[PDB]
């Protein structure tokens with residue numbers, strides 16, 4: 001008897017990429033399930049005995065080393081930010097991204113992006129640090145999505161930026177290229193001062209990158225050239241580990257390093 | 264002319280511990296301010312030229328290494344959790360901690376603690392990992408406080424726990440002792456199965472620790488012995504760097520590694 005769709009969904013939860021297992025084979029569900037449970041338990045046992053690191057934490061540490069070694073200051077700014085920051089980012093209540101904001105009190109929200117806080121750091125550090133000013137942050141961001149296969153409501157962004165000298169399109173592309181080649185992730189940069197560039201892996205957007213200046217800058221007290229880009233860590237993990245579903249790369253109680261925890 | 268209280272507040276923002284500067288000295292405000300601005304800019308310049316690491320990120324990486332090296336699995340679980348988890352933690356709407364929860368939708372909240380998610384991981388991993396099960400998480404937690412000098416609304420917790428064999432009071436105390444002596448933080452353990460222990464630095468609570476089992480366990484499908492403790496990273500930093508105000512240790516736009524960013 002062929003497998004049901006429910007049975008197949010269950011096995012797919014337990015399936016890891018390159019299991020090299022045959023589903024249309026003849027063996028009963030009970031046996032296919034038991035084999036996969038056995039392998040996934042062995043996977044968790046191996047992690048526990050050997051490395052013990054979470055993929056998302058580990059990627060964050062690897063990205064952090066990359067940017068610190070190339071002259072970028074590590075920032076840790078608030079996750080809960082004023083709603084006023086969202087309007088000052090030019091996100092009107094009429095816009096689609098405005099519908100995606102998780103509001104917290106009358107006055108606050110979960111940040112949907114790193115830009116507002118990094119803008120403020122750029123302005124502030126310009127009074128203390130020599131040109132060029134190079135900073136980055138990694139951390140949680142939040143957007144209400146009709147999520148599915150490549151959007152999470154709770155995700156993790158990297159944003160880096162440089163302000164002052166050396167803020168060219170060529171340098172932005174070179175940093176992106178060095179970064180992704182260091183992680184071992186395949187990509188192409190797609191796009192036409194004011195440039196928006198998308199870093200794609202096939203149809204999947206890994207990053208939006210910007211070559212400033214842009215008019216928004218003056219709302220944040222910024223009047224120098226700048227370059228920057230934002231990457232989703234879960235997307236990077238999804239590509240790197242060949243997960244079919246981005247939920248396998250998320251902060252989660254249902255997956256650990258892409259392995260089902262419902263065993 | 265003596266300094267005003269406002270002037271003194273301003274200088275205190277710029278003052279770092281062991282500046283060895285004399286305020287009741289005779290020199291005008293303008294000059295004292297200029298000296299401190301100069302030193303704080305030099306501090307940021309030194310960080311930028313040399314290490315480039317944020318203290319909170321760096322402490323997290325150091326704590327992570329400590330626990331991974333001693334057999335604990337690194338967890339990264341959701342920050343946004345179901346409100347049902349809070350009631351199942353035995354936090355009634357009549358309780359004070361219930362007033363402190365940041366609600367997000369009808370159904371979700373920002374986690375005020377790590378326990379509910381770690382409970383779920385303990386139950387799940389018990390089907391896969393050999394006894395004893397040893398896990399930890401580090402990350403953001405949220406409580407509405409009348410904050411002041413030692414509470415933040417947005418803070419960072421470490422929680423570790425062990426379940427199964429070896430779950431004794433002596434072992435819990437030994438792990439706490441090794442951890443704090445590794446960080447170089449002075450402490451005493453204060454307290455009388457079911458034990459609550461507070462780890463104190465003078466009057467400042469660094470941790471609450473628990474020797475299970477306790478009755479709550481069965482709401483989470485846990486029926487084995489366990490031990491665990493939760494530490495605030497910002498409190499640890501405050502003690503370690505001798506900050507007078509915990510805001511200097513927080514995720515912030517006003518302080519970087521305890522140095523004012525308003526220069």
Ligand SMILES: CCC(=O)NCCCC[C@H](N)C(=O)OP(=O)(O)OC[C@H]1O[C@@H](n2cnc3c(N)ncnc32)[C@H](O)[C@@H]1O
Nearest residue numbers: 113115119151152155161205206207208228229230231232
């Ligand atoms: C100082 C300002 C600065 O430095 N600006 C430069 C940053 C420009 C860009 C600016 N940072 C920007 O916001 O784009 P995005 O909303 O498309 O998000 C960027 C990336 O986040 C990931 N991402 C976005 N939403 C999600 C989601 N719901 N789930 C998972 N990953 C996501 C995804 O990888 C996407 O490509």
Ligand SMILES: CCC(=O)NCCCC[C@H](N)C(=O)OP(=O)(O)OC[C@H]1O[C@@H](n2cnc3c(N)ncnc32)[C@H](O)[C@@H]1O
Nearest residue numbers: 376378382414415418424468469470471491492493494495
């Ligand atoms: C599986 C369950 C488990 O493993 N349980 C063991 C954990 C027991 C204990 C359990 N984890 C517990 O919740 O106590 P707390 O609310 O007093 O918070 C603990 C610590 O967080 C810090 N802390 C708490 N609130 C704040 C704040 N508003 N600002 C800064 N630091 C804070 C502070 O260091 C405090 O000592």
Ligand SMILES: [Mg+2]
Nearest residue numbers: 198205207208
């Ligand atoms: Mg985009």
Ligand SMILES: [Mg+2]
Nearest residue numbers: 461468470471
């Ligand atoms: Mg307490």
